[PDB]
Design an enzyme around this catalytic site. Structure first.
Site, PDB file in Angstrom:
ATOM      1  N   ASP A   1       0.897  -1.248   0.112  1.00  0.00           N
ATOM      2  CA  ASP A   1      -0.053   0.032  -0.033  1.00  0.00           C
ATOM      3  C   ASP A   1       0.876   1.239  -0.134  1.00  0.00           C
ATOM      4  OD1 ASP A   1      -2.712  -1.216   0.176  1.00  0.00           O
ATOM      5  OD2 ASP A   1      -2.209  -1.683   2.174  1.00  0.00           O
ATOM      6  N   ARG A   2       2.165   1.099   0.616  1.00  0.00           N
ATOM      7  CA  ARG A   2       2.808   2.676   0.798  1.00  0.00           C
ATOM      8  C   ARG A   2       4.169   2.501   0.400  1.00  0.00           C
ATOM      9  NH1 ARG A   2      -0.707   1.252   4.852  1.00  0.00           N
ATOM     10  NH2 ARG A   2       0.984   0.317   5.951  1.00  0.00           N
TER      11      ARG A   2
ATOM     12  N   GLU B   1     -12.680   5.689   8.772  1.00  0.00           N
ATOM     13  CA  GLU B   1     -11.966   5.574   7.531  1.00  0.00           C
ATOM     14  C   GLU B   1     -12.609   6.050   6.249  1.00  0.00           C
ATOM     15  OE1 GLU B   1      -8.650   3.390   9.646  1.00  0.00           O
ATOM     16  OE2 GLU B   1      -8.888   4.768   7.863  1.00  0.00           O
ATOM     17  N   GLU B   2     -11.614   6.420   5.183  1.00  0.00           N
ATOM     18  CA  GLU B   2     -12.034   6.438   3.930  1.00  0.00           C
ATOM     19  C   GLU B   2     -13.352   7.281   3.676  1.00  0.00           C
ATOM     20  OE1 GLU B   2     -11.041   2.522   3.117  1.00  0.00           O
ATOM     21  OE2 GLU B   2      -9.136   2.972   2.812  1.00  0.00           O
TER      22      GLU B   2
ATOM     23  N   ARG C   1     -16.165   4.299   6.814  1.00  0.00           N
ATOM     24  CA  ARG C   1     -15.924   3.092   6.951  1.00  0.00           C
ATOM     25  C   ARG C   1     -15.362   3.009   8.509  1.00  0.00           C
ATOM     26  NH1 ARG C   1     -10.724  -0.053   3.778  1.00  0.00           N
ATOM     27  NH2 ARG C   1     -10.116  -1.760   5.620  1.00  0.00           N
TER      28      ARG C   1
ATOM     29  N   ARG D   1     -14.605  -8.751  -1.505  1.00  0.00           N
ATOM     30  CA  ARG D   1     -14.863  -7.702  -2.431  1.00  0.00           C
ATOM     31  C   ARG D   1     -15.369  -8.150  -3.927  1.00  0.00           C
ATOM     32  NH1 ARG D   1      -9.831  -3.804  -0.089  1.00  0.00           N
ATOM     33  NH2 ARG D   1     -10.736  -3.591   2.052  1.00  0.00           N
TER      34      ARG D   1
ATOM     35  N   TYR E   1     -12.938  -0.812  -3.550  1.00  0.00           N
ATOM     36  CA  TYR E   1     -13.656   0.773  -3.406  1.00  0.00           C
ATOM     37  C   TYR E   1     -14.785   1.138  -4.023  1.00  0.00           C
ATOM     38  CZ  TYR E   1      -9.661   0.813   0.441  1.00  0.00           C
ATOM     39  OH  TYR E   1      -9.021   0.692   1.391  1.00  0.00           O
TER      40      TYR E   1
END
Ligand SMILES: *[C@@H]1O[C@H](CO)[C@@H](O[C@@H]2O[C@H](CO)[C@@H](O[C@@H]3O[C@H](CO[C@H]4O[C@H](CO)[C@@H](O)[C@H](O)[C@@H]4O)[C@@H](O)[C@H](O[C@H]4O[C@H](CO)[C@@H](O)[C@H](O)[C@@H]4O[C@H]4O[C@H](CO)[C@@H](O)[C@H](O)[C@@H]4O)[C@@H]3O)[C@H](O)[C@H]2NC(C)=O)[C@H](O)[C@H]1NC(C)=O
Ligand SMILES: *[C@@H]1O[C@H](CO)[C@@H](O[C@@H]2O[C@H](CO)[C@@H](O)[C@H](O)[C@H]2NC(C)=O)[C@H](O)[C@H]1NC(C)=O
Ligand SMILES: CC(=O)N[C@@H]1[C@@H](O)[C@H](O)[C@@H](CO)O[C@H]1O
Ligand SMILES: CC(=O)N[C@@H]1[C@@H](O)[C@H](O)[C@@H](CO)O[C@H]1O
Ligand SMILES: CC(=O)N[C@@H]1[C@@H](O)[C@H](O)[C@@H](CO)O[C@H]1O
Ligand SMILES: CC(=O)N[C@@H]1[C@@H](O)[C@H](O)[C@@H](CO)O[C@H]1O
Ligand SMILES: CC(=O)N[C@@H]1[C@@H](O)[C@H](O)[C@@H](CO)O[C@H]1O
Ligand SMILES: CC(=O)N[C@@H]1[C@@H](O)[C@H](O)[C@@H](CO)O[C@H]1O
Ligand SMILES: CC(=O)N[C@@H]1[C@@H](O)[C@H](O)[C@@H](CO)O[C@H]1O
Ligand SMILES: CC(=O)N[C@@H]1[C@@H](O)[C@H](O)[C@@H](CO)O[C@H]1O
Ligand SMILES: CC(=O)N[C@@H]1[C@@H](O)[C@H](O)[C@@H](CO)O[C@H]1O
Ligand SMILES: CC(=O)N[C@@H]1[C@@H](O)[C@H](O)[C@@H](CO)O[C@H]1O
Ligand SMILES: *[C@@H]1O[C@H](CO)[C@@H](O)[C@H](O)[C@H]1NC(C)=O
Ligand SMILES: OC[C@H]1O[C@H](O)[C@@H](O)[C@@H](O)[C@@H]1O
Ligand SMILES: OC[C@H]1O[C@H](O)[C@@H](O)[C@@H](O)[C@@H]1O
Ligand SMILES: OC[C@H]1O[C@H](O)[C@@H](O)[C@@H](O)[C@@H]1O
Ligand SMILES: OC[C@H]1O[C@H](O)[C@@H](O)[C@@H](O)[C@@H]1O
Ligand SMILES: OC[C@H]1O[C@H](O)[C@@H](O)[C@@H](O)[C@@H]1O
Ligand SMILES: OC[C@H]1O[C@H](O)[C@@H](O)[C@@H](O)[C@@H]1O
Ligand SMILES: OC[C@H]1O[C@H](O)[C@@H](O)[C@@H](O)[C@@H]1O
Ligand SMILES: [Ca+2]
Ligand SMILES: [Ca+2]
Ligand SMILES: [Ca+2]
Ligand SMILES: [Ca+2]
Lengths: 389, 389, 389, 389
Positions: free
Chosen positions: A70-71, A196-197, A212, A291, A325
């Protein structure tokens, strides 16, 4: 040009029409297409653009290996003309980092990116393509933000940010910006237990952010923001129709003021809803566990009624295909009496669900409201994973 | 900028000169070129653009496999600067779907795309790059449209659409738009028995659409539209020179008011004609059976005289090379006292006629009228299929 | 904007400074670069652009095989931003065909392309990006033109065209255009016996075209055009310094009014000169036999003195490297009291001189005058042919 | 609309925030990315752009072999939108050559490139995209310049140039330009003993250039320029904190007026500093021997105090990663009351440090000052050299 004011009501919505689809993975099998994730769309007086966090590599490139991560210092918020796929050739770098938001105030675009190590991240706030403000982490644990568009009213653009644990109580703040400068900072108040988000939209002078709860709730927190007073309240979506993933079965009643817990194996996914009395629509993955799939459910009074259930549905992505998402945006500059709800679904391909490839990326589909009763089909990604093996 | 008015007559045409050719298949053998079909051109005050339905893949990409298929969620109307080949890097997405039309009214561009499943398609109508109107299928059988440009007068842009069987009576409508909004809807009237894929142009305040009867006729339907009154009439091209494909040999006499039953093995192909008394020109494939070759025939009074035959000819693509759909457009904003006819021919490569490859795509050639007597040669696609094997 | 006029004198030139180089073959070894030949540059009020005849294929593509061939339906005149290499993604199609010229009159750009079969070619004349005029072949033998920029004066842009044998007397005409419309057509007059591929520039109200006699002369024809009266004269460069290829050794005296014969094995190459009394410069290949090397020679009174020889030199491309066509252009819109001479050299790679590859293409170098005494080095193509084997 | 005036003071700087990163090597492993070196950034009223010297080949191209070599006829200054990687498709050629500078005076951009052989190089000075002036070598030994942006005040843009040996006394000049025309030329005066590759910025009507002494000093020369009087002085940075590479250990005291010598094996690297009393920052490689790592050191009174040491530090690139040249730039057109320091670091990959590949290239990172105390991360080039093997 003038500042956008959220003067209009939401349009009536009875079904959803196709707005855009970039087919990025299909095309990126051969063309030079950047690896992304965490996409969204945002509009301005001239039209609408797609946004996402690049991984600083193409999809067929050897550096696509490891992009589940992710980062990194190689990620950046990029934007491009709606409908095109993101290449190194047609993409604008908005800011550098691994969490973002962006919105246009009617005059210029504000873009925000966080970067840095987990214990020492920082946001840079850009306005009209120049850096204006920097904000250091306040909790030393992945300072982060919406991953979809912010919303502005009379030049004030509230942005929801979180710093702290993903799996426990954290420190969420609402920061009110004007021309990239901090007007006011508020600590989160109210009944939402973790944020979140957030996915946010404006109508009738009110901004609503549907977020979230990664800690407890399979029901989504809702932050209601007054952009003039620069104040907010928070609670949960009241409806029994649970819209996070993973989630348990929908209970007999929801809960306006506390998380409904349960579900397995994952604690949350970014999502959204439009909340306007009878004219209310909730997005969710079709799977309660994974998902996969995406459906829109019209649930009148979802925001206020714990017994509210669906009166109609539209499958956006069938349950045999991967989603990801999802978030809200609106073309606030459309030539219409009302603000018409739009949304996107991120279509994740590759890891962890498809482990025969070394990479993780996505494509995008976006839809907006129609007052008509339109027919539908599945707008899945459409790439064949075997071609990448 | 003002609305275009169809105040000019058609220019005298004695010959056709080359306007543009994109050589897309030749170039796409190595460069990142999108798979397309159903192309056209359309102009605006600033110049002219190429249009086509992308298949959401490059030509050399693995996803080019299966692109014989006409309808998928991965298709979109794309436009690009005339003369360039269509790549993921130089193309604008006009709308999402698998049947389209587009035209400029002098102020902004209207674009329309149908998408969805066969029994539940819907049109989205765009204006100035924003979605304005949605139209649900009325007959539940592939709601569909022109596959070349519409034409506007005083802001009113009529579009011909069909919903229902390809092989029987269907439900055709003329929908009159202004700034993307529906002004009026008429059911098809007159003696045309079946309507597909109209090619339309304007002159002297009259719009003529030359279409494809996919049901019975090897002669082409002609729809005559008054965009001020928003009324129309329909019949068949009168000439014995039959212009659909497949077709039988040209008979002794044509038939203005009934289909002349066709040839073998194709029910039809999109085509066009310019109908202006003595100054009338009919396009058709050279083959009566198949989409090969392309010729322009000057057939004085083709619109009114069942005995009318050719007085001159120009070979556009020789009969040793593949053609495809053809259609009309005009640069209505040219610095000329008359509107000069132009047309394109789609040059189809790959399946079904060339089954040594897994894909179907096309390139484009476009020509416009000359008053001079110009020499000609064949403007075939020019790619070597063996290179793709 | 206003129409350009040519009243200014030529700037003094003592040496040549680098203006641009595209390194097209180096880059095109691994990027998507179009096969070209017959390049040039042309300027307008905003800057300068590169021009060439595309072959409608990339350099690394399989369709590059056979690009020695000069004329096909897959060629077009393309332009692009000076210094970039020509790709399918950054090039503008000016017109379709296999011989061209182009020039800006101060208001808009005129571009002209010939296409068609040898016995029936035609020119299409474009202005401001729209087709204006068409011109049929008059002698039925490859109607053709300059392959470098034309020049305009008070709206009038003369163009030199040839139709007929390459190896004997042919039919050359000067056509005077305004806004792409024919003002006047003149047959070639004077003592030049054969004319190909004129390189033209303006100064002091006069246009000089320095051309290629492909029939007899190793000395270059010179056509002097008055764009106000629309009349011309013709003769040969007087200097003993012979500047066509192939050519014999320079004689003790040149000939102003007849071709000087000799040289083997090539009948000619496109070239240029700037003729301005003492301020006169002649370009030529360094080899007398072949298109290799390139040198600029300052030859005072080359236009009038048969005994005139060089007083200075600058090697532009060393004689161990391939050159090709060369031609004149000027930035007529520079902020200067005089018009500064510029030129380009086409750097041909591949066939016939480099037979280890299947293709023929080129890159470009361009230089302009300096009043300073600048040092120099060789601006050869720079690609390694082995890399393409 | 107006000439930039250097009226504003430097902003207070306490830490550095990320501005841009292009990830060129990661991306260019698969996409068409040009080989470069000697990059920088420069801004204008509209935004900021990245600049570098292309090698006239892509990174994956066979011509990338041998690109350790600094000077060739195939190099050019290119510019592109900040944040994108440099491809053949998104880059503007500013001028041709192998040493450069560029700056915007508020009206238009001046760009300068040196090219030619070592013994006879020449500069061409461009303004608003047109060549204005040429300067021949004065010392016959690689005429050369800054390799980062110049600075303009009231239309006057001073540029520091050197001609002469790299390893002995050379001939440095300051040349003052307006609209690309020479206003004044000065020979270097003062105590700086050798000048290369100046990094310059302005504040409060003064331009300060922090350079590379390639002959003796491991401390950096500082040229102070008055752009109105067009005069200058020179000396060395006073601080004991030595900032060239290679360098010895920092001594007890620096020396304002003479070089501090020593270090092994290399005589210098391009670098920079911002000098504003207490508000002073020095960049340098972390390694004292090699071009690895990069650190910013807040060194109060570095310009005046021989005992001045660091009071804070920020690691920009970790010492396990390769760095390279670094330079100063400022967005002089920001909507702020002070000029905010920015800088870039060139991240060199390939030869000679990584000899498992045949090429040498770089990517770019850029940062600007923050008044906040921001957390930090290493912004190394994130490419895996093994992928290129
Ligand atoms: C360079 O490019 C030029 C353009 O300048 C091109 O011009 C074309 O030339 C041909 C003749 O070479 C013209 O062809 C005419 O076409 C019409 C219509 O043909 C179509 O329909 C017929 C009937 O279905 C089909 O058979 C045919 O295949 C086409 O599809 C014909 O009617 C013409 O026939 C007459 O002229 C012939 C001589 O040209 C006679 O042999 C024939 O018997 C016909 O004659 C009668 O009519 C004449 C009047 O046209 C009259 O003169 C006679 O006395 C008699 O009554 C003919 O085949 C074509 O239209 C031209 N196209 C254009 C756009 O101008 C050049 O040929 C080319 N030059 C080269 C290659 O060097
Ligand atoms: C050629 O173009 C020049 C440049 O535009 C014209 O120059 C003008 O000349 C008149 C006098 O004749 C002056 O009053 C103007 O100031 C000039 N304009 C500029 C901007 O220099 C010139 O007139 C033109 N000559 C012809 C005969 O067309
Ligand atoms: C095909 C490929 O490149 N696979 C690599 C593998 O060698 C490496 O161990 C891993 C972790 O860095 O990344 C992946
Ligand atoms: C329509 C509306 O709400 N009125 C606002 C006004 O109050 C505000 O001062 C101005 C600037 O944002 O825009 C308008
Ligand atoms: C022929 C067909 O339509 N289906 C095939 C399937 O059998 C095969 O497993 C797959 C991998 O090659 O490709 C597809
Ligand atoms: C070029 C032109 O005449 N445009 C006209 C516009 O001016 C007018 O308002 C309208 C009604 O005729 O039709 C259109
Ligand atoms: C070379 C290739 O990719 N061929 C595929 C084939 O394997 C597959 O069965 C079919 C339908 O899925 O599409 C095609
Ligand atoms: C060192 C060298 O090569 N000398 C050259 C000379 O021959 C040339 O005339 C001059 C200008 O071109 O530059 C110097
Ligand atoms: C394998 C190859 O290219 N051989 C070359 C050789 O011809 C050349 O003399 C030398 C100098 O560059 O490098 C090596
Ligand atoms: C702020 C600005 O850029 N404008 C100034 C203007 O006020 C001044 O007259 C001039 C001084 O030469 O420089 C410019
Ligand atoms: C893989 C490759 O191209 N290697 C070449 C080598 O053959 C040659 O000796 C050298 C100098 O020209 O350039 C490099
Ligand atoms: C927890 C942590 O690492 N904090 C660091 C701090 O030491 C340093 O001042 C700053 C700038 O590099 O980065 C942050
Ligand atoms: C090149 O084209 C020629 C002529 O068609 C043909 O003989 C040859 O096979 C081609 N070569 C390649 C490698 O495509
Ligand atoms: O399976 C997709 C989705 O479609 C709808 C419902 O009828 C369910 O069957 C399911 O949640
Ligand atoms: O005269 C024969 C010829 O006449 C005309 C056309 O109808 C052609 O198709 C036909 O071949
Ligand atoms: O319309 C083209 C047509 O014209 C006539 C004949 O020459 C035919 O062979 C040709 O196909
Ligand atoms: O040798 C004399 C010399 O003079 C000059 C040119 O004519 C050259 O070609 C020639 O070599
Ligand atoms: O003009 C170029 C020419 O100049 C002189 C000599 O140095 C020649 O060898 C060279 O070819
Ligand atoms: O404390 C030693 C330390 O002091 C400071 C700098 O001079 C550094 O280079 C050095 O390592
Ligand atoms: O500025 C970098 C510098 O900061 C401090 C120490 O941790 C050093 O080891 C390091 O090199
Ligand atoms: Ca949850
Ligand atoms: Ca039919
Ligand atoms: Ca000759
Ligand atoms: Ca040094």
């Amino acid at each position: 040009r003038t500042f956008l004011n959220l003067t209009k009501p939401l349009c009536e919505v009875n079904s959803w029409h196709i707005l855009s689809k970039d087919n990025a993975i299909r095309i990126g099998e051969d063309a030079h297409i950047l690896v992304t994730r965490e996409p969204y769309l945002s509009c301005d007086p001239q039209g609408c653009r797609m946004f996402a966090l690049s991984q600083g590599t193409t999809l067929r490139g050897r550096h696509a290996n490891g992009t589940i991560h992710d980062r990194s210092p190689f990620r950046a918020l990029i934007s491009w003309e709606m409908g095109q796929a993101p290449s190194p050739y047609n993409t604008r770098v908005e800011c550098i980092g691994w969490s973002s938001t962006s919105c246009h105030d009617g005059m210029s675009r504000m873009s925000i990116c966080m970067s840095g190590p987990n214990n020492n991240a920082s946001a840079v706030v850009w306005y009209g393509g120049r850096p204006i403000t920097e904000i250091p982490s306040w909790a030393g644990n992945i300072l982060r933000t919406q991953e979809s568009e912010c919303v502005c009213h009379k030049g004030v653009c509230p942005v929801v940010m979180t710093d702290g644990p993903a799996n426990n109580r954290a420190a969420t703040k609402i920061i009110y910006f004007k021309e990239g400068k901090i007007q006011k900072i508020e600590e989160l108040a109210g009944n939402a237990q973790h944020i979140e988000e957030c996915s946010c939209y404006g109508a009738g002078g009110v901004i609503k952010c549907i977020c979230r709860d990664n800690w407890k709730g399979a029901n989504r927190p809702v932050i209601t923001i007054d952009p003039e007073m620069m104040t907010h309240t928070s609670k949960y979506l009241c409806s029994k129709v649970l819209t996070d993933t993973s989630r348990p079965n929908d209970p007999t009643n929801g809960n306006c003021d506390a998380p409904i817990t349960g579900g397995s194996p994952d604690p949350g996914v970014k999502g959204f809803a439009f909340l306007d009395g009878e004219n209310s629509w909730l997005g969710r993955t079709i799977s309660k566990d994974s998902r996969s799939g995406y459906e829109m459910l019209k649930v009148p009074n979802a925001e206020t009624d714990i017994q509210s259930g669906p009166i109609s549905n539209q499958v956006i992505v069938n349950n045999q295909n991967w989603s990801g998402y999802s978030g809200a945006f609106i073309d606030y500059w459309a030539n219409k009496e009302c603000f018409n709800p739009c949304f996107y679904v991120e279509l994740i391909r590759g890891r962890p669900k498809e482990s025969s490839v070394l990479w993780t990326s996505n494509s995008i589909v976006a839809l907006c409201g129609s007052k008509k009763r339109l027919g539908s089909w599945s707008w899945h990604d459409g790439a064949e994973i075997i071609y990448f093996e």
